[PDB]
Design a protein around this ligand. Sequence first.
Ligand SMILES: Cc1cc(/C=C/C#N)cc(C)c1Nc1ccnc(Nc2ccc(C#N)cc2)n1
Ligand SMILES: Oc1ccc(C(F)(F)F)cn1
Ligand SMILES: [Mg+2]
Lengths: 415, 556
Amino acid sequence: IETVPVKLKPGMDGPKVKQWPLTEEKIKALVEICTEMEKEGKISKIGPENPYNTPVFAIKKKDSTKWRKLVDFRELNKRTQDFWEVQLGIPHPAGLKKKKSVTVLDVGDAYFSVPLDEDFRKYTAFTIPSINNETPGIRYQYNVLPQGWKGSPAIFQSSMTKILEPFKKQNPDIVIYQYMDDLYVGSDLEIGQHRTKIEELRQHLLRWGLEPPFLWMGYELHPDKWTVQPIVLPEKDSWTVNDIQKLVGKLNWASQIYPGIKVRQLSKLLRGTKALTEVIPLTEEAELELAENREILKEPVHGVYYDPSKDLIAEIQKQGQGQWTYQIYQEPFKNLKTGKYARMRGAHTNDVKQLTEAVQKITTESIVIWGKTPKFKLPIQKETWETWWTEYWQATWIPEWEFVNTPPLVKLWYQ
Amino acid sequence: MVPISPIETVPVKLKPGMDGPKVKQWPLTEEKIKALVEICTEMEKEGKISKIGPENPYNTPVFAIKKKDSTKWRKLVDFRELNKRTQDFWEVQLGIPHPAGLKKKKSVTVLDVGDAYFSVPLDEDFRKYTAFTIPSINNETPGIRYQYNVLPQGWKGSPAIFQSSMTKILEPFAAQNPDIVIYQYMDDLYVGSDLEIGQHRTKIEELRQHLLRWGLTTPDKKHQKEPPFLWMGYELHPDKWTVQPIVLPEKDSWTVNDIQKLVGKLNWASQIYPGIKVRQLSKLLRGTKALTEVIPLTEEAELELAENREILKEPVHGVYYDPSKDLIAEIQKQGQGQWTYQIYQEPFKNLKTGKYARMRGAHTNDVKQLTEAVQKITTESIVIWGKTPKFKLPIQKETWETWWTEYWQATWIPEWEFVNTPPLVKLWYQLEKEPIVGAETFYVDGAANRETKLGKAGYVTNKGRQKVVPLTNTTNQKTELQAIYLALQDSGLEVNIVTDSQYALGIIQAQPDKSESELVNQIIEQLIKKEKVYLAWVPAHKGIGGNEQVDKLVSA
Ligand SMILES: Cc1cc(/C=C/C#N)cc(C)c1Nc1ccnc(Nc2ccc(C#N)cc2)n1
Ligand SMILES: Oc1ccc(C(F)(F)F)cn1
Ligand SMILES: [Mg+2]
């Protein structure tokens, strides 16, 4: 009810980010949402003495028909002070990734109950544009904690802990983790049980609230079943020259990750100048070297550690037929997680929708495991991505990304 | 009197840490001073400025300019210094409407709101910063000191504060009269509608009565400006639009600057004149920016200019947007990385046209360029009409599916249909996914000495065919490409090729059909002639048979 003082980082002005083009349907939806938010006092019109801006658009959360306003506070979040005043941070719970079920709740509506520091409001300015710029864009700023701003869960943290105390005391084995507008609630119960504890949890908020438009939803995960991708070599009875070349190629790449990989004896099978399709019998020396490489590849990678002060990097490869491979790392060749997807999810003919869904799932896994989002290296032209990703976005956060314009050879080895 | 509502003032600040201006007022002739005193006396009576004491330490210079061919002087308060120290504002006019997104209107009336501009007060706490001084006759008394009470012309914040103040006034009238449109440009309001002229003129009078609420008067003698409107380089008519006349000059010899001005006109014309081309003329601007240098026009530039004059021989007009109908966008390949498009709703009635140019880059192909043109048109269309048009593209559905299923990047094109108008975009080659049974296997390699630039390229095959070619003025990367070229030259219609060049595979896996490197272009021309080509990669210097042999031959 009293505002927490907030500042930007030293020597750093507010965001002045261009609003990108919006479709007619998205503009209509935002005009309706913001008219209501204005009546409720959450936002207020602003004048031309405010030159700041943050992009806004609208989405439809997974499995609903109602538009949700989404502000892209990525720039403001970079420029906002860090919040260590009461807590040097919320030590990430390592047990969350080990629960059998984790439901994600959109609790962002609760933030609207806390006023925003009067001196910081100007920096949350945004614009609803008009088609063809025929009328002046509608300019607003926030009077309360905005959804999507990193300072919102920080300022509301004291209030959230108090709301949840009765539920935590009564259910001590439940892991509850908050990231931005999301609440991740993990349990080891049978799903039927689980769904009922989640519904118990909703009521604590409804009770405190007395209506949140998306609090009823629930995104169910199962991190204990999350699959990884070790390096595996083919098992064949007939090896062509081409098969062996691909094998030696993959082993050469693996040797950057695993020390004791050897290809001497396997290369020695190719002695001469043979047709690619000619079958080569494996020598005993080559079979042994191959088996020893198999054994090496069953062990973890040496010297792999997570450092919370370094960026997480996510790379994605399109493998075809709706399949995607990805790796998360901080140092080259020190993968902290690898994976593979195959579920296009209503996108069997849209590469870009598939990639957008992959980005969201990888970000979700990254939030659960380490409590922050990775920086993506996306296999797509900037202009294509920039034009379309907002059409398929269903998360309330947005990660960072860069673009890969040269085809990686490593695609072959994660196949 | 009738009470009027005040216009809320916008609070204004100087940039952090800066103070107001303190500029010395030069001296002025006795003639100019007398003129300024009379002008400023009138302005003071009108409430625009007020005399101040000597405590105010700020000052901005004032000038007197002779309005040409007249005995009347005009005043100029030069706020350049204060503007550098005034905060940034929100500028609403950055994005201007495109005529192709407008709707047809039966009537459009213009209202002069020039006098309303001076009912907009300046933030009281900022006025001290606008102080200026009229020098005294012979400098024997103190100068007359004034400051502004209203938005000064030439001050940084006046355009934004004026527009935001008019918009705020107009919002309730627009919201409660959804059958009209209102647009402000300079000192004028433009009011359009589809109402019968009687109802339309009633709305206008109601708008005048609404503006009186704030004491804003509008001339009774209605505006002299009438359709067509000359606006931001366009002609706006009630039911059509075009660009203002495009006149390409005749000239025996062309200058850098002339070509820059010619291309600018051609770019401006390309938004309604179909098929404008500017590549060969823009090539003449490569690298150089000596505005007075003369450039000989290539024969290709003279044809392009000849074609453009033909296109511009007679007027073309666009139609306005009809929201009840779909948008269609049709694209054509023009050559040399140039693409042209038309956006229409009814056949043969374009809303607008445009063009797209290949991005600078080492290697490219038609499918990537078509995709990029689609992304540009989509984004432009969201801006103007708030929706994506349905595309008519010169590429076969089967070609597109082969492309995007096999391309290493994610790519997407929205709803579209094939239009069979040459030249069609196609795939010129496609590499095999598996080695080819029965086809000779070529193991290629090249190498060059970094100092003497001498190198070798060659191959060895499973049939015993071999070649090594000595090369001069070359590099490791050039010889690796040269080796692949030789294998393509010397093989039959089906061929397996084994390379250790990661560089060569990065290029070919990007599937170019045209390159800035003539060597890559030669490789492309050989690939197009083949039936089957499988390209295999192996790591260098690992004792791989075949690769090991030829590496030794070429690095010798
Ligand atoms: C942008 C704009 C510029 C001018 C003009 C500025 C100037 N000078 C006048 C108006 C009224 C507008 N605003 C809108 C909004 C929606 N449809 C239209 N259609 C429309 C406008 C003018 C004519 C005509 N003649 C025909 C149709 N205009
Ligand atoms: O009256 C003036 C006009 C211009 C200047 C300047 F400094 F800008 F040159 C000073 N005094
Ligand atoms: Mg070599």
